[PDB]
Amino acid sequence: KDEQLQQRRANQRLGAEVMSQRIREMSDNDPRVVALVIRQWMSNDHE
Amino acid sequence: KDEQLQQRRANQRLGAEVMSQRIREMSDNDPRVVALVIRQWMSNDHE
Amino acid sequence: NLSGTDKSVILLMTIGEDRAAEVFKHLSTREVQALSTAMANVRQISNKQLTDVLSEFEQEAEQFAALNINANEYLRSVLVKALGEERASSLLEDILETRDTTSGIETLNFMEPQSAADLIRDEHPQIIATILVHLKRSQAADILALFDERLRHDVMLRIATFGGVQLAELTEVLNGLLDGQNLKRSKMGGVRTAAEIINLMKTQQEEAVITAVREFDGELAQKIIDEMFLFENLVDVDDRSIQRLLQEVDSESLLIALKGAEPPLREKFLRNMSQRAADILRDDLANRGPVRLSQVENEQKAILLIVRRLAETGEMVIG
Amino acid sequence: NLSGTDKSVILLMTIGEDRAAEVFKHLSTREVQALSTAMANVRQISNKQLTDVLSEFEQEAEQFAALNINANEYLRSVLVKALGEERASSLLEDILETRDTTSGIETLNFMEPQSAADLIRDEHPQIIATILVHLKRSQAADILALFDERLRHDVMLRIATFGGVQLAELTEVLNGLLDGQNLKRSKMGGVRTAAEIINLMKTQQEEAVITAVREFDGELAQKIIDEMFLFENLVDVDDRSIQRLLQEVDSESLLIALKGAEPPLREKFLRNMSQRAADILRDDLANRGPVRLSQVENEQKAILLIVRRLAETGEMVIG
Amino acid sequence: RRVVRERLQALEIINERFARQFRMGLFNLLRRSPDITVGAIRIQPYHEFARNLPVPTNLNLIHLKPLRGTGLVVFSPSLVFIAVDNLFGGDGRFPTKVEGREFTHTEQRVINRMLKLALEGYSD
């Protein structure tokens, strides 16, 4: 049980970090998709 | 789901950039088809 | 939906930096600034939007097919070898100025007549007469109407005297007056924005302001009050518009507003209604007791906001 | 549930340090400080939360697709080769200031009218008039209402005199007033927080404080008492709100509070109730004997806390 | 006991040409041609000048290297009011008078533009 949950957390972290690298590469290759989503972020923050 | 959407976005970007290169080459080889469409653009902008 | 400007903006990013700079040179600096601001803020194209703008540009390119070059020099070079460069420069400049002076004529026709008149009020009466002749007869009259009697009479007198029909200098005259608009800005100078703020201010505060400006200038105060005029009397707003208000505003709010209104105001707001509606309104006004004036003023302000919205829609005129 | 700020905060950690610094440069220093505090305290993302914030960011990226760069320099460089760098700097700065001055106009419209008026009270009457003209007519009136009669009258008089419609200096004027807000802080200066503390204090203690401040300044004491005013008389709070209290507070607590209340207070708190309820309350008040004033004061304080909560909800106004 | 006498020639012409330069500078700054009337050069003790100075008014220190000491310039509240309202395009037919009240931040900034323009004019 606990060991299975720990392994699930580990593989979830691995998937999260590789997919975060996907964010990193797409943001590096296209800044426009970054500024507008930042604007959406601040819209959500103030809303 | 999300991975399929990401791959769709990637291939759409590739198609968009090659077809934009098609615009680039046709505009380079014929400026007349550019000025009139710019006039149409400003017509749409002010209309 | 994507606006026509945004599609054009996305196309301007897509066509490349050198082509964008060339288009900036070929177009107006205000357009250049608008495109720069647009590409700085948020990109205008999404994957569906980019598809749409690119597809509609393609359909524009399919339709704009002619196998030709802009030749802002290549066409002249082919002409120059056959006839010589000189057999063109002057004539081409004259043709462009004729296009330019007609463009200015149309622009002056479109832009506001009194603004044109005051821009040309300082100018020569011969200038006024020739520009009036060149303009549309509706536009020429509109500039003429906004003049004083003496200047206007001199303008019509000089209309006949204008027999020189001069030609390069006229275009340069249009160029000179054109360069003064971008510095003029304005568009708020008229005693209307201050009038709206006076309406917005607290009742006693704008009453004191009205007294102060009456002390400052009775004529200016009277002009601003004429700008104030909104359903304070029957003749200015007309019985049809009085009917329009009552059929567009809540009856309870109208009655509460009429509580503090003048008896001529009640009479003008009751004549339009039928006998039954007028009797109901009069009975409600008689039965309802005194109410704190704050709510009455707030409802009156809301009603006048509705009136201003109707005037902006332009169904009928007020004044 | 994860708040929109926390999702944005987690995304700010995830996007990398250099990108976070660039976003800090592109955004406000208050946002930079908020993000720094958030990443210092507790991380905002759990494994489900990180999945949610990353997924929603992905859906934002799918929708925000345009194949474009921010180009806070690259776009200018493409424009500069085609037309020249100068054919832009001035126009781009003017456009940005127009966006900046409109941003300041909207900010002033949103922020409190009297605060804007006192921030501009020291400033030039021409400044007041032009800012009033530029502002919304509701906002312009709100700043105008909070002025003295003489300054207000001068402002409306100068509204007409404002014909220069000046343009870079106006933006710099907005910049100058903008830089004074971050130092102003305040937001408690008004004699309201002290009023709440006076209410919180022990009955005899705030009575002595009221006497002392009456000695210090009768006008200030009267203003603070007007701030005190909470269901001490019928006209200030209105019969509808009196009805609202009785249907929202326990009858026993209301009666115990009415034990030490004035007979006008009992009359105003009995008129709203029906005949049966009023008779029951009067009989209970007559039958119940004397009680130590500590419990009566505590229940009155609880009732007034309920009244303050109702006022905060904003169903009806009090005063 | 403090006595000084002298007669001056050159600084009169210097003031006249600086006044013309300042007039054209203000003309281009405020899109309206001003007129400057240079008064007769005044020689007086510092206390007399201070007494004659209309309080309130803004005084500014401008050093003159390599000569030891700092120069002084002053501007009237009427002048700053008129200049700032002309900057706003105000007619000025409803003027206000402020006494004892220190200049606001914006007013001090406008004073800063007059100061820099005058400094450049006198420098040239």
Residue numbers in the entry:
A (entry chain FA), B (entry chain LA): 514 to 560
C (entry chain MA), D (entry chain GA): 3 to 168, 172 to 324
E (entry chain HA): 44 to 167
What wording appears in the published article?
To inform on this pose, we determined the 4.6 Å resolution structure of switch particles containing the extreme CW-biased FliGΔPAA mutation. To build the model, we docked modules from the assembled CCW pose as rigid bodies into the CW maps. The CW pose contains significant domain rearrangement, particularly in FliG. Here FliFC–FliGD1 and FliGD2 of the inner ring and FliGD5 of the outer ring each rotate by ~180°. As a part of this, FliGD2 changes the subunit that it binds, altering the domain swaps. Finally, these rotations increase the size of the cleft between the inner and outer rings from 30 Å to 40 Å. FliGD3–FliMmid undergoes smaller positional changes, rotating approximately 25° as a unit with a slight adjustment in the binding interface. In the CW pose, FliGD5 rotates and presents the MotA/B binding site to the inside of the ring, with torque likely transmitted along the same path, albeit in the opposite direction. FliG has a conformational difference between CCW and CW poses that moves the binding site for MotA/B from facing outward in the CCW pose to facing inward in the CW pose, which changes the direction of rotation of the C-ring. The CCW and CW poses of the switch also help explain cooperativity, which induces the subunits of the C-ring to preferentially adopt the same pose.
Rotation is driven by a flagellar motor, which is a supercomplex containing multiple rings. The C-ring (C = cytoplasmic), which contains multiple copies of protein subunits called FliG, FliM and FliN, switches the rotation of the flagellum between counterclockwise (CCW) and clockwise (CW). The switch is also the site of torque generation for the flagellum, through an electrostatic interaction with a stator called MotA/B4. The switch also connects to the MS-ring (MS = membrane–supramembrane), which transmits both the direction and the speed of rotation to the flagellar rod.
